[PDB]
Ligand SMILES: *[C@H](c1c(-c2ccc(C)cc2)c2c(N)ncnc2n1CCCO)[C@@H](C#N)C(=O)OC(C)(C)C
């Protein structure tokens with residue numbers, strides 16, 4: 597792999613390291629400054645002895661050109677750590693910014709889901725599944741609040757479909773070859789990416805998550821809700837929401853992964869297609885962004901205990 601950058605020169609040579617902006621067990625995101633131009637960037641630093649970042653980086657190299665995918669700017673490998681330099685996101689988490697907008701509308705929500713689902717329809721069509729589309733991994737690059745500034749930002753769990761050979765495959769070229777039940781697994785992962793977008797949508801419309809009330813909810817109870825197939829689309833915050841939007845929600849959160857909408861079908865839904873008939877007036881939402889952040893972290897911690 598030309599992703600063998602161990603031979604060139606120094607990250608610390610060309611950038612000034614600033615503060616952490618995110619932390620995990622085998623990687624860290626810090627903010628940084630390109631010494632020569634004084635321009636700001638983010639840099640995920642990845643421990644090579646703990647994880648192999650090759651698939652993330654390749655995916656970023658091939659698809660980072662997408663207007664709604666985080667854009668890779670540089671990358672180093674001093675041997676022990678890979679330094680992945682990107683554009684720095686100045687708009688914060690998308691869902692959080694939206695929840696703190698008292699007058700957010702259905703029309704806005706549809707444009708947001710369009711932009712995001714368009715992006716995942718493209719990834720899926722190129723054989724990529726994200727596997728971890730939580731709302732905290734979707735950010736705004738600036739504070740304009742335009743859909744154009746949405747970025748999906750972490751591909752640390754993303755998977756590119758391959759044949760046994762180790763050769764890259766698109767869902768379209770299904771001739772080979774390396775297709776043993778791996779078929780169904782990719783098919784299920786893309787369905788989980790859609791589910792995650794259903795969760796995002798639910799929460800945008802009403803200001804709460806469908807399967808968790810706060811960070812204190814036990815993982816067992818969240819899983820029971822998730823597996824019950826049942827969730828409320830009535831009353832309170834749901835009264836003021838169109839029936840077209842509730843319909844789309846039911847189909848993106850459909851408990852049956854085989855009945856769950858595809859990205860392609862999501863974009864053919866009237867709530868996405870006839871945006872121009874969607875109301876621009878206020879939605880009636882709960883106002884508890886921090887509680888939601890907790891419930892969201894709870895929902896994914898409960899799902900990701902194994903993975
Ligand atoms: C990293 C992160 C990034 C970022 C994403 C991807 C790559 C290759 C490099 C950096 C980033 C950017 N570009 N702008 C603003 N904030 C950014 N963060 C921090 C978000 C808050 O934690 C994180 C993400 N996404 C991340 O996942 O960090 C750990 C893996 C948890 C350490």
Ligand code: NA
Nearest residue numbers: 660662665667
């Ligand atoms: Na991009």
